[PDB]
């Protein structure tokens, strides 16, 4: 097909990501849906923590748990710098 070339992206050094150009080389994934909430990080220490910060779910590498309404942090530890988001669902 000459009419049109496409662009396609492989490993090493994304190319173009639909997320931040420029923020995409994230040693992690953050994904919520509703009340799930998925946190992948390849050798990592995972620890969800409510709002009141008390420990409420603990896990490794990939973590999947149904929260409901609430303010919540999930801490992302990985080998070099440890990385703190915060999961609001409503």
């Given at each position: 097909?000459?009419?049109?070339?496409?662009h396609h992206v492989?490993?090493?050094?994304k190319m173009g990501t639909s997320?931040?150009d420029?923020?995409n080389?994230?040693?992690?994934?953050?994904?919520?849906?509703?009340?799930?909430?998925?946190?992948?990080?390849?050798?990592?220490?995972?620890?969800?923590?409510?709002?009141?910060?008390?420990?409420?779910?603990?896990?490794?590498?990939?973590?999947?748990?149904?929260?409901?309404?609430?303010?919540?942090?999930?801490?992302?530890?990985?080998?070099?710098?440890?990385?703190?988001?915060?999961?609001?669902?409503?």
């Amino acid at each position: 097909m000459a009419h049109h070339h496409h662009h396609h992206v492989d490993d090493d050094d994304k190319m173009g990501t639909s997320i931040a150009d420029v923020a995409n080389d994230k040693p992690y994934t953050v994904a919520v849906s509703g009340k799930t909430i998925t946190v992948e990080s390849p050798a990592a220490g995972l620890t969800i923590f409510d709002m009141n910060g008390r420990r409420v779910a603990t896990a490794k590498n990939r973590m999947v748990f149904e929260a409901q309404n609430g303010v919540y942090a999930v801490r992302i530890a990985t080998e070099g710098k440890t990385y703190t988001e915060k999961v609001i669902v409503k």
